[PDB]
Ligand binder design. Sequence first.
Ligand code: HEM
Length: 338
Amino acid sequence: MKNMPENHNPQANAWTAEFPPEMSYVVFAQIGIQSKSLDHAAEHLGMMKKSFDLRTGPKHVDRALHQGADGYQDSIFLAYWDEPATFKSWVADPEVQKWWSGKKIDENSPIGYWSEVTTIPIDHFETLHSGENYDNGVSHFVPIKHTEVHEYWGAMRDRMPVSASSDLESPLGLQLPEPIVRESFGKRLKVTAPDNICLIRTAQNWSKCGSGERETYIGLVEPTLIKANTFLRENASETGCISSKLVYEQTHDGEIVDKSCVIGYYLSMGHLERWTHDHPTHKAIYGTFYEMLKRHDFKTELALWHEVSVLQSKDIELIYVNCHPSTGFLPFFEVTEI
Ligand code: HEM
């Protein structure tokens, strides 16, 4: 590990995914229905829900709700496979093909469709968990193990196997170009990303907190998490953050549960590192979590985790049908009409 300090002894425990040898990829698919009122999205969401129960459906799927720009909401499925061939057979299923790639989105539709499908090579992937929790993304179906490789700047990079042999820099260098405003409503658009973009899903789960911890999380952490995500959304070029969403997770039936996450894409892992290590909003929430840890013998019922991947252009498929121009990758890079 390159960045680990001498005689490193972390204050808090943490766990990390330990992938079996036969696993080569994780498919992480984000599929969204975009609307101004959730009633408009009900029909699509019903169809997609049933598709996930196919024999080729994902090993795990979360539902979440995103409040986007200017009154648009995204109803999102976060779906995981451990076998790309199974994912491809799922997409090919006639029931999935009824709605895949926004097929039902007609002209002048009140809803949009988008999908961001990432096929993650395992050597370009790492996870971290504040507890031995088997309901955190891939930990629903991958074992996890205790690790010392955390609680220092650069630990995320060190946990990703390929960082020992690659700097993981963008071919575009250090500056994300100014966003542009696409005429994206009424169109079917595919965006091509540059190599070595970095995707993070970083999650907060207060479902097991008693009153004390819950009041602290809601009163003292979440407001600054909201501030952090807003800053990332509004300052793409300064930060290198292509896209950031704060989403609240839901039951199968759509009810909001006590879980959230930020899903963000960055021009490179280095951009994500520099924001995390430097910005005051992450400074503030990091400090509060360690304040909670000390007050609870370094075992809070609040659970945090993240999944971080570094992606090649060919690893990610980005499709936006009748979407608001601020959605996802639409402001950046190369676009084509499908
Ligand atoms: C916009 C939302 C967030 C982003 C993008 C983000 C990003 C990151 C990244 C990339 C790291 C790894 C740093 C490294 O290893 O170099 C990290 C570490 C950490 N973050 Fe966050 N984070 C976010 C929200 C939060 C929240 C809400 C909390 C607490 C409630 C939090 C607490 C921590 C802690 C405690 C660590 C240290 C983990 C360890 O290595 O043991 N973060 N964060």
